[PDB]
Amino acid sequence: ETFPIEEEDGLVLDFLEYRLGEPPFPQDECREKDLTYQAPLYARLQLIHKDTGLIKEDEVFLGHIPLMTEDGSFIINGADRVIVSQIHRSPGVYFTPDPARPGRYIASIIPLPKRGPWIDLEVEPNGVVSMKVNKRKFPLVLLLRVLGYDQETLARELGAYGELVQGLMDESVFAMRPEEALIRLFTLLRPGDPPKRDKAVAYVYGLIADPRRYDLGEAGRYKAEEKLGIRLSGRTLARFEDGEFKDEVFLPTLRYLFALTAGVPGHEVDDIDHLGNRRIRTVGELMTDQFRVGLARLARGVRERMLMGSEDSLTPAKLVNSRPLEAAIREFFSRSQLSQFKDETNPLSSLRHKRRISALGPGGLTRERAGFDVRDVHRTHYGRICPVETPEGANIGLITSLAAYARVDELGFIRTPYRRVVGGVVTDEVVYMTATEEDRYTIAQANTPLEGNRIAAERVVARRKGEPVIVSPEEVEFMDVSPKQVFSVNTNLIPFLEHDDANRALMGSNMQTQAVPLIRAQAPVVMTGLEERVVRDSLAALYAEEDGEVAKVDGNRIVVRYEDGRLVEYPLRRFYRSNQGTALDQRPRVVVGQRVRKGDLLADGPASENGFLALGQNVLVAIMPFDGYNFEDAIVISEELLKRDFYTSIHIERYEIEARDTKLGPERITRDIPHLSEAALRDLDEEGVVRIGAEVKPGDILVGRTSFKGESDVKDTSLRVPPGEGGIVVRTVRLRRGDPGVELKPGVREVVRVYVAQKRKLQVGDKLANRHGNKGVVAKILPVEDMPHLPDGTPVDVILNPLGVPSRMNLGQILETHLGLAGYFLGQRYISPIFDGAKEPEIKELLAQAFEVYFGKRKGEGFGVDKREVEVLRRAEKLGLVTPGKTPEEQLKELFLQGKVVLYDGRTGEPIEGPIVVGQMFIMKLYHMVEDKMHARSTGPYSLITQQPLGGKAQFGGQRFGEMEVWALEAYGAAHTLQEMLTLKSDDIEGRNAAYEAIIKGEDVPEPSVPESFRVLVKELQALALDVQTLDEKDNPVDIFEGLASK
Amino acid sequence: TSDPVRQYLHEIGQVPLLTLEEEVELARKVEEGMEAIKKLSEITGLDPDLIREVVRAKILGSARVLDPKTVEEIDQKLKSLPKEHKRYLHIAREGEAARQHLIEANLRLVVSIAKKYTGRGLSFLDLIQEGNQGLIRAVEKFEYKRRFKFSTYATWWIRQAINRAIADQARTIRIPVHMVETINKLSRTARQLQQELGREPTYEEIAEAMGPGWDAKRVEETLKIAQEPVSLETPIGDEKDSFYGDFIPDEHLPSPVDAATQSLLSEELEKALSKLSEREAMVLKLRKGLIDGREHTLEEVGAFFGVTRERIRQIENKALRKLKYHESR
DNA sequence: CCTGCATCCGAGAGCTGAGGAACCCAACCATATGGATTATGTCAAG
DNA sequence: CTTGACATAATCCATATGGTTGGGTATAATGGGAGTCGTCTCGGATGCAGG
């Protein structure tokens, strides 16, 4: 499109082909050296002189283009990034009701973003039709005259529809020639600018007819062709042929508008939120748009050089400056809101990040302006966008997720699959449909009963344009493929989802992404059957490429001998820091001499157990209150979890320092540091860097550095461990000037990085969650002997408060607990797909078998029923849980089939007065760790202008005492406390110095003074030429500057 | 109303262009008016510049705001010219009018030249104004005797003015013109070398390609001084709540800990001196800059007490030993 | 002449937390470097 | 408590080097360019319509 770069009346530069080379550096080197993983782009071009025909052909280097990795991300400046897809209004022709005036309609023509102006057509109340473009109302009949339309042509094309055609006609315009009409239109659109003929021609051609300026996309072309029932030749609204304008879209659009206004059947308004009217721009399209912008800037530069350069001695290399293209690509991949720091807390986090759909971004919607209509779940979202997974705050409904079976077509429209039904017989043919195509049929639910593959049900539940209906099997045309297709990948991992309220299912879906990998992670006892596919598609684990046999196994290597006879070595990623500080390592799961078929697992990735997604741990839980320690979502856990290293995670931190050049002399990284005893320099090596394996605590030196003090001869500028951090030093990396592939900033001699590792155990203040939206902070860790225990001596691991269930209405966790109890005693795991899985009777049969094991084990040893069990059974007999007249064993089994057991209190030995729900639950540790959040400050750095404390834990900052905190202090009448907050603790410089000195001297703090921010306010008001004066009671000036600003 | 570029273009287009006869006529009038100005300078014996300014002030009229009194007195002094000499004054007036018309008519060439310097640190109107300055220079320096067209001589001056203004005003931290040329040459050489090599060149390659007198260290320094400052108001994060300057600590003012340490140190020094004799403490304070900030020499302190420098030195050493004892005590 | 009536434009829309594109040529003050002078402080002694 | 004799830092002018600044180019040239259409109501100033 951009080439050929014709020069005005000459030289012509024409594009021939391009190629992409191989990357100069591999992915891991790019990560280590802070480089972009990219490939060089070469374009072969030829310069032809118009008259001579002398052709100079050259291949010119255009720069580098970033390369997507195998998993679908990019390495930009050494950091992993994901481009988020953008949802927006599809280009084309739309017709909407006029909001101000009923019975009238507005027609809209919309091109691709930044590829033309939106064009409005509207029937004015006085009868003349008017088109608005670039905020300029003017009559459409003028442009129609320009396009070459006569009175007879318009009259015969639109005579049928009544008086609208009479309102169209205007004899003043129609007496002019298309040249006069062109000049007249140009003078309406550009008032004042001299009306040269070729100038007007160029302006109007660029408005609607230039393919390099206006562009209805392929999507817009398709939508217009299907809506208007006409055929486009290109992507513009009009053509410039034989020196004159030919219409393409305007008359069909106006005919549709008139037919709609006349109530003619077969003409309808458009739903702008319909998923047939909204499309997805993916990574390729966004990158190509930025590439086109850069190419246009390059074309401008080429034309300038063609004008200025010596036409005799010119080549394609000399004409082309590739800086704008590189700048556009860098800008897109480094500053675009849609280019995001990849979320890699666990593999599911990255997979979910790659499937995100955003309505925001450049050219998108605004978070404050989006109201109700865009945040809603449309009926056409069914099978295309998950109705559950979305953020909870101000971004709700603006960021969503692609449905599991959905596909984005070549035009950008999301398609979903349906099985074809013919004559009441469900077939294997699967058709992927857009929402518009889907609207034409009657689609049966996937849970329709079948005999063989014939619909064995007289009444079938179906959708007709989203409306639920009941139909006979004959009227059915298509059937859904699976319930899984309605929800996203994260929501598909919640078992018993049909028993959960949507809000808490949202919380569970979102919280699965914050799960931290654990060193003893397990797969859930109750699964939905999608864990293995999630692990496989994340490229976190290692699988055998072909059938073969394993030759070498190591903690860092697996060598496999395939049946081809070729030895293949797979290195293992070990203790690698993710973007979020979690450690991602691969652990071999194969032995030497083992035979492996194709696709067999070789090594487990992070948060994986034998190829299954393993986000947390299966623990024994009891659902009961406990001494107020699980009050309002708090959680009580047993110390036995800590004893056997459950919920233990590994975290890695990176600390970086630089030695650069200074005017007072260069900095240097060295061990020779003044004014420190050898107790402070124990762990440093001979080069001034801490040794691998040393333990470091807050205040310890990591990298030694000395700087020239000056100040009218060296001083300590070393890197130390910040408060609240530390651990074991696991890595050190040094990058020096001149080293291959290193690109330091000017002046920086060298850079040193240190990687420090931590093994974090569960502690009070940590956050735990299950897959059903139940989240809570650990509030108490009890010794084993205090935990409630089963009659066989087994203690529970977790106690959850039952008050979290009734108002949250997430009953799926209860069914999960019952199935977990059955599996715990039967020693098995379960796959329970959503909306088609385990029901209550099956769980009851499994619980009956589990009770046979749980009780026959006791009966064999020669034990009857406990006295405490008899007392609890009496209480339950009063409660109506068991039927009177049965033996104690029968009543115990009756309780067990309800998921309840007799439980004993570890502190007293007496039983809990009622039976308690106990079972296995899958619980994950979340990335919100109290270690990373506790922060305090007495004094520290202050800001440059306001002289107030800085913000953030990293800056050793202070807490913000905002407007409503001040309101609360005022409402208490606590004047002196508020004055302390405003002056002695924030920006009264003399006041804070005096307060600190008085406190360390044992006295009480003095009275405060004027805060510095008010002096700044006075100075800024003087800069606006306003005289602000402070006065005493007698209206005389009071100098708050102590005399420093009076001449 | 708004968009001053359109307003300026309209006002420029309101002035018609020139033909060869009109252009040569105006240039000849300008040159002959300057000759008349210098002849009047010889006749009256006064400075040529001042009479140039009075002629120009009288032409431009009251509307344009040296002052009215002196221009009036010298204008009347110009009315004492007998005959065959006031013709020079008429020629000078016509020449100044010709200069104004020449500039007004050739303003459009300035716009045509200046439209190809956008995106280099200066707005379009600023470039246009500097081009106008260069056009005034070209008008004054033009020689019609060479029969060359005016635009041929005007383009060079307009381009020079635009380039010089760009070198002078494009950067917040001003960099001299020769260093600006050096930076531009470095960038162009690096771009050509990258086009040849197919990758970003290293500093040694650029140093080799610059020529004699260039090493990699010099290229590094030159690239370092070419860095432009960033804004304190650069938004951090998506929400409009975090700025860059919010993350920058003040390193100038003393901290409360530092101020408390200094206050305690001053109190400790005062106590140590008050432990000594008052006379020797005063001598120490005078010599060590405690009474008046400034440090004295032995001669000055001795002159205060009317004693020699070495007596001051010896009593200061006795006070130093007393400080030794007190610290030990 | 008054009055009302759309019309246009302007200023609002919760808090805390985390977060990163000419080149050349010639004259000219500014600052640097050298050597000599000006008080500053010490080593020795009376 | 001085008194005296070197041995150096601190200032003082005299240039000499690089860094900086002003001036100059002569075929002819003659009006720019990116952009943006998904907020909602509300309140005052105001031009336009009627009587």
Ligand SMILES: Nc1nc2c(ncn2[C@@H]2O[C@H](COP(=O)(O)OP(=O)(O)OP(=O)(O)OC[C@H]3O[C@@H](n4cnc5c(N)ncnc54)[C@H](O)[C@@H]3O)[C@@H](O)[C@H]2O)c(=O)[nH]1
């Ligand atoms: N004063 C505020 N307190 C908040 C806010 N959001 C949550 N909270 C409190 O934190 C508690 C726990 O938060 P939650 O577990 O819901 O938060 P997560 O960190 O797990 O995030 P998500 O629930 O997945 O989604 C929250 C989104 O909103 C953002 N968020 C997260 N925390 C905040 C805060 N503090 N302020 C503003 N916005 C916040 C965050 O970046 C996300 O995009 C909650 O019960 C509230 O008491 C909030 O906006 N303001």
Ligand SMILES: Nc1ccn([C@@H]2O[C@H](COP(=O)(O)CP(=O)(O)OP(=O)(O)O)[C@@H](O)[C@H]2O)c(=O)n1
């Ligand atoms: N934007 C936001 C989001 C959250 N918040 C605060 O966070 C709390 C938790 O909301 P939540 O939805 O996490 C629970 P809550 O409302 O307490 O539920 P319950 O009745 O079941 O106990 C809110 O009540 C607000 O105080 C805020 O100030 N601004």
Ligand SMILES: [Mg+2]
């Ligand atoms: Mg939440």
Ligand SMILES: [Mg+2]
């Ligand atoms: Mg609450």
Ligand SMILES: [Mg+2]
């Ligand atoms: Mg909360």
